[PDB]
Amino acid sequence: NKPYFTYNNEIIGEATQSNPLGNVVRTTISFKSDDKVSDLISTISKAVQFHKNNSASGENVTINENDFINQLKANGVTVKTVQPSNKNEKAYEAIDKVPSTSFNITLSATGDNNQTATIQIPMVPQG
């Protein structure tokens, strides 16, 4: 009766003893220099739904942006704050430099009865 994610409405499996990569989504999110962090999070969030138990309707995953950027940074992405050119513009965070190697982003959520589900989403740099 476990909580679970879907990605574009496909049920994502658990990591199992036999298949420890059972929760790696069959997708790739591409990213490149100048991509807005908000746009990458939006792409992931549109695709991912969490289910707090086996029969529950899907709910939006809310991805913490600080956690997300720290995952990017640990995996060789450098991040820039693009500064506003005057007081009427807003700063935003964007991909600065990309690594050569793919990596997974980890997303977890806690459902009913403090049961946690985790999925891994592959990130593909374009150079």
Author numbering: 56 to 182
Can you list sentences taken from the study reporting this PDB entry?
S-layer proteins (SLPs) are self-assembling, crystalline proteins coating the cell surfaces of many prokaryotes. We determined the atomic resolution structures of all functional domains (I-III from N- to C-termini) present in the three S-layer proteins SlpA_ac, SlpX_ac, and SlpA_amy. The Lactobacillus S-layers are anchored to the cell wall through interaction with teichoic acids (TA), either lipoteichoic acid (LTA) or wall teichoic acid (WTA).
The full-length SlpX_ac shows differences in structure and domain arrangement compared to the SlpA architecture. SlpX_ac_I accommodates a similar fold to both SlpA_II, with SlpX_ac_I being slightly larger. Likewise, SlpX_ac_I is structurally conserved (RMSD: 2.6 Å) to SlpA_ac_II, indicating the possible dimer formation as observed for SlpA_ac_I. Therefore, the SlpX homodimer might be incorporated within the assembled SlpA layer via the two described interfaces.
